[PDB]
């Protein structure tokens, strides 16, 4: 069953987005939209429940205050974080990738506090369940 | 700026896992769910096409069993050489692994690099997380 | 300090430049030069007197390329998957790959997974950086 | 081609040396002081020939203690070339390991590992390098 409703989008992005779509070979924004949806779906099904899950929290940040902070909130989650890897990027982007495996509620949990930390831009998940 | 409303046909079924999913997450209606799964698209198809620099992280979740991504990155460190900058594997279980690379370079190369790592068989789930200075991380 | 005398044999040519470099860093002699080495090599392997929880890492280097030496590498970390936290590929050239291995535990199980990894054909050199935990 | 020479070491050293080498597997004390010879001089003859190296650096350390986070934020700029990544693991209450991927110029390799390892709150740590893979010392 098709279930049709409105949406409002930024008119530049949405030329922007037919354009795309367009010359990919989409047939209409609802074909283009529901591959997002599937795709988002399986991305953030770990989120419903509180079942185990593996994976990594990518941040971007940059240098001191902050990367003792990332430390020691490592420090909170000695269960679920197994290891963090930290390339320099350039002269004001570091990057960090946290490897962790636990119950979703507290890996949703870490991850809140560090994107709601000082210093850090964004981050990204890529969770499965385990 | 110009919000502009139009129509869209989902399946139910797909609507409703959206519906539930979205709400964990805390999205305040369909619409803001939607523009951003929109504005991350275009994102990653502008850095495509425009070929710009970009660093990022592979992820890679497979089955001990069934994939033989070690050997398949191993492989790619000499082609890519100056891309990979590190690679990073997990035993997290009696049956998933994760193998984690960062890479820096050209989007169309990094984009060549995943497109790889993932249609290896095996993977369970996978993705690439690239920024390009730090704005955007998709 | 009761100095025990005792005498070795070492081929000519390591000793020749092991006295050439002695006299450079300034040493006196021999003796001093191999206290030294000696004191150093037994900070490097004290972890393995006994069988306490020790944690480092075990660093190898491998052709990649001979058999299929990383699914054999990959199989033994897996069976071992308690004791081994995280592993670092570093690519050294298109046949030679440096692998390095977080681990932890008992002493004795360690010492064992080493000896396997060290023991797969494929494997060139391994190294251990260990230590007991807790103090 | 062997030299036989006579050498003078204090007596609880070469008890600790003794017991090591049993447990080892070393057959003899000459076998195994002559691994450490040769292996002194492999990264001798690395640093003074400025040669180029691909190696890690291990510090298992206190990070109640140590300034570690510190020092290696300080190396990680001085040195973004040599210094590829750096891998994080905290271990127990207490202990902390920190693997650090180099490649470049022996000499520098080395400056930054013995600034690493000569700091306080590390309990132990090595620089682990080859140049070519032929030699692991
Ligand atoms: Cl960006
Ligand atoms: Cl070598
Ligand atoms: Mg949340
Ligand atoms: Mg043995």
Request: proline content about 1%; some cysteine; charged content about 30%.
């Amino acid at each position: 069953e098709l279930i049709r409703f409105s949406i409002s989008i930024p008119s530049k992005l949405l030329e922007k987005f037919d354009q795309i779509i367009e010359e990919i070979g989409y047939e209409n924004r609802s074909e283009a939209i529901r591959d997002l949806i599937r795709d988002f779906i399986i991305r953030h099904e770990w989120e419903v429940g509180n079942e185990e899950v593996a994976g990594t929290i990518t941040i971007v940040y940059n240098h001191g205050d902050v990367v003792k902070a990332l430390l020691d909130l490592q420090h909170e989650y000695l269960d679920e974080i197994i290891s963090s890897l930290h390339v320099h990027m350039d002269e004001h982007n570091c990057l960090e990738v946290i490897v962790v495996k636990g119950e979703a509620k507290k890996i949703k949990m870490i991850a809140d506090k560090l994107l709601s930390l000082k210093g850090v831009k964004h981050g990204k998940l890529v969770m499965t369940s385990t």
